[PDB]
UniProtKB/Swiss-Prot annotation:
Domain Thioredoxin: 1-131
GO biological process: cellular response to antibiotic
Compartment(s) of residence: Periplasm
Name of encoding gene: dsbA
Pfam family, one: DSBA
PANTHER family the record matches: THIOL:DISULFIDE INTERCHANGE PROTEIN DSBA
Name recorded for this polypeptide: Thiol:disulfide interchange protein DsbA
Keywords recorded for this protein, A-Z: Disulfide bond, Periplasm, Redox-active center, Signal
Organism of this sequence: Escherichia coli (strain K12)
Length: 188
């Protein structure tokens, strides 16, 4: 078969019922995640290969970066609650990995302020119980699949993408194979 278990994807031993159809996990501390966002634009290219309107979900994880890692999961919950993911993803990545100017929760907050989210708006969300359950949702989703590594993508709670089984001599061909694999898995 052109696509087979163990090559472009692996199959979860215990599938996860009611999981988001396309679910990505990442960390602002994760170097491949940085490339997946800035150099490869994986989420964008996957979306362009799936039917219009289908739900793609993207969640942050705690297991990289200790205290700041958890702050960033809460900040990502803020970003999702306010709908400003597209505004803060790049400056958070660069603040953590490129300039290394993000060292505290205050520094994370500055990224949002510079992105134009008002201070009162950020702080009210940060302390909201709506963001607490959004944090809980990100944790539960990752715990359901015993996630020990990012970047990760799961399809229908059943299939996990295997980018190590794809060729990386050409960055565009890799993004293609990844997006085409998500499509094939989604139709499975
Ligand atoms: C062209 C290209 C291909 C890539 O393929 C990848 C190879 C491996 C991973 C997974 C991984 O690292 N994990 C997960 C489990 O264990 C912890 C760490 C992701 C992407 C990565 C980057 C680029 C670029 N530029």
């Amino acid at each position: 078969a052109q696509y087979e278990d163990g090559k472009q994807y692996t199959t979860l031993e215990k599938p996860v019922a009611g999981a988001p159809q396309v679910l990505e996990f990442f960390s602002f501390f994760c170097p491949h995640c940085y490339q997946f966002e800035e150099v490869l634009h994986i989420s964008d290219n996957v979306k362009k290969k799936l039917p219009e309107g289908v739900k793609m979900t993207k969640y942050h994880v705690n297991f990289m970066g200790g205290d700041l890692g958890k702050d960033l999961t809460q900040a990502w919950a803020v970003a999702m609650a306010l709908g400003v993911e597209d505004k803060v993803t790049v400056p958070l990545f660069e603040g953590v990995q490129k300039t290394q100017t993000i060292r505290s929760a205050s520094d994370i907050r500055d990224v949002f302020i510079n992105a134009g989210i008002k201070g009162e708006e950020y702080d009210a969300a940060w302390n909201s119980f709506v963001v607490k359950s959004l944090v809980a949702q990100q944790e539960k989703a990752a715990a359901d699949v015993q996630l020990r590594g990012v970047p990760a993508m799961f399809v229908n709670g059943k299939y996990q993408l295997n980018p190590q089984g794809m060729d990386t001599s050409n960055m565009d061909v890799f993004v293609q194979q990844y997006a085409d694999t998500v499509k094939y898995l989604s139709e499975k």
